[PDB]
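does this look right to u?? calcium ion version
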Amino acid sequence: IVGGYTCGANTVPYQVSLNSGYHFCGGSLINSQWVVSAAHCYKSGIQVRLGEDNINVVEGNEQFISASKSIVHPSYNSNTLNNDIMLIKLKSAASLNSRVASISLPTSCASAGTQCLISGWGNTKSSGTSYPDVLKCLKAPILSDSSCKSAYPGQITSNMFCAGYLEGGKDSCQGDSGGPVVCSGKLQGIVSWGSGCAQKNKPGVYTKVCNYVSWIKQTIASN
Ligand SMILES: COc1cccc(CN)c1
Ligand SMILES: [Ca+2]
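got this back:
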């Protein structure tokens, strides 16, 4: 997260870190045994880490649970990043509490202008590299489809939305991938892609979660 703020420990209780020896992606807890992330975060040997603030220190509220299975969206295209969504099932159910909690799926798609919360442990610099160890947060509006399409000609599908600031300076970044965009207490987006971070006229692009609710529910119900 570039240009954000320190969230505060366990203030984003649905935020998870995906760890394969090291943090590589964010995700969102959507019930006691399932996480939603980006398809481009797919790999083997994933451990889900819940209740994290400082990802380098065991602070006392963590639950570490290995993934039993990952399910990448059947229509995911890694070139265009269309359908950039994947489900991860936990080997055992997380113990839910005030600091480890699921986030509700949307019943409706959020409109342009809606304020949302984007969070992650990604890079905090727009040039060069610095990784925070504590969770960072950014409040950002959803942008209009037209402004999003104008920013990225030929690349925005009906399964994507832009959020952030056309002026730059505030954005998601490398390592935030797969993490939440939450608006009015619902998971509306997943950190997917962009052109660099916090650059003028290159806002972050997010997977449009409201398009996948049926797939998520049906997949969970049979797996
Ligand atoms: C360039 O790497 C990125 C990864 C995730 C999200 C974003 C959005 N600026 C960028
Ligand atoms: Ca920790």
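The chain has two domains: 1-12+103-210, 13-102+211-222. idk if thats expected tbh
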